[PDB]
Amino acid sequence: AGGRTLGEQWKEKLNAMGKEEFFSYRKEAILEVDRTEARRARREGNKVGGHPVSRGTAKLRWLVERRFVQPIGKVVDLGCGRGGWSYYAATMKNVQEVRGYTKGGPGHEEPMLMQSYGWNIVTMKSGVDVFYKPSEISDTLLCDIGESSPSAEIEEQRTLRILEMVSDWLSRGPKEFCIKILCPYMPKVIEKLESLQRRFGGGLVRVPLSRNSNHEMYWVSGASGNIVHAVNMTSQVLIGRMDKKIWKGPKYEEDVNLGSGTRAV
Numbered sequence: 001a002g003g004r005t006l007g008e009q010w011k012e013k014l015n016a017m018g019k020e021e022f023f024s025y026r027k028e029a030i031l032e033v034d035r036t037e038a039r040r041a042r043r044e045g046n047k048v049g050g051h052p053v054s055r056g057t058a059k060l061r062w063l064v065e066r067r068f069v070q071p072i073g074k075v076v077d078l079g080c081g082r083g084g085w086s087y088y089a090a091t092m093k094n095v096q097e098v099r100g101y102t103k104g105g106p107g108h109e110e111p112m113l114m115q116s117y118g119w120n121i122v123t124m125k126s127g128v129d130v131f132y133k134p135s136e137i138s139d140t141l142l143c144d145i146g147e148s149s150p151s152a153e154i155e156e157q158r159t160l161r162i163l164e165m166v167s168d169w170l171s172r173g174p175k176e177f178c179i180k181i182l183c184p185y186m187p188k189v190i191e192k193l194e195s196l197q198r199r200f201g202g203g204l205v206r207v208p209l210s211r212n213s214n215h216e217m218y219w220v221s222g223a224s225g226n227i228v229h230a231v232n233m234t235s236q237v238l239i240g241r242m243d244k245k246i247w248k249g250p251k252y253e254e255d256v257n258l259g260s261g262t263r264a265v
């Protein structure tokens with residue numbers, strides 16, 4: 001097929017949007033968690049109330065509850081940030097260890113020290129650029145890296161780089177995985193994904209907690225099916241939410257409770 005993909009058309013229409021229109025559209029009909037108590041928790045220094053460190057936790061929870069991924073054994077979390085995913089994985093029955101890597105530093109999130117349930121099996125290391133980290137054995141591989149750009153070409157290249165690095169870690173045998181695809185609608189990214197699906201399996205899913213201001217999808221081990229179809233479906237939904245007559249806003253949802261306490265190691 002010649003011409004632009006649907007996702008590229010979405011991207012173009014998104015780039016043309018004015019400030020006010022962008023912030024209404026961003027959350028139109030999306031799923032959102034109420035982070036109010038988690039923000040007050042952060043500022044009180046409450047590490048034992050079960051409040052997630054970020055909105056990421058809820059996204060991994062959406063996926064795990066639908067069995068799109070089932071964390072087990074040694075979990076590696078690439079781009080762990082504050083630890084939203086690392087700490088949620090540590091709450092999972094058959095997870096034994098969680099190792100998170102993240103760059104940190106100015107402008108970026110440092111891992112937060114929490115006492116959510118299983119906190120004692122989490123080890124997050126800041127100051128790590130994963131593109132230069134030699135792969136290690138894992139049973140579960142998580143990766144939540146992807147910096148946005150108005151250019152789909154710049155996003156395409158970013159995504160491919162992630163896919164190349166992710167393929168390394170996947171070749172070390174993890175059968176459970178969950179990987180953010182920044183820009184899944186560009187032809188080269190599709191080509192690579194389709195190849196990766198042949199070798200490692202899985203499928204691409206859109207998480208409804210994602211904002212309409214991005215087209216991020218997760219390549220997850222528990223999913224299957226035609227990648228092109230899944231992607232186009234998302235483009236169509238995101239486009240269908242554009243140019244709304246009246247903005248109804250997001251559907252709110254309760255945040256995840258991660259509890260507290262250590263677990264047997």
Ligand SMILES: Nc1ncnc2c1ncn2[C@@H]1O[C@H](CSCC[C@H](N)C(=O)O)[C@@H](O)[C@H]1O
Pocket residue numbers: 053054055056057078079080081082083084085086101102103104108109128129130131144145146
């Ligand atoms: N090359 C790189 N190496 C390590 N971390 C990176 C990186 N590029 C971006 N990052 C980090 O990856 C993080 C992705 S957002 C992390 C969200 C996390 N899953 C959660 O639930 O909290 C950002 O904090 C960013 O600092």
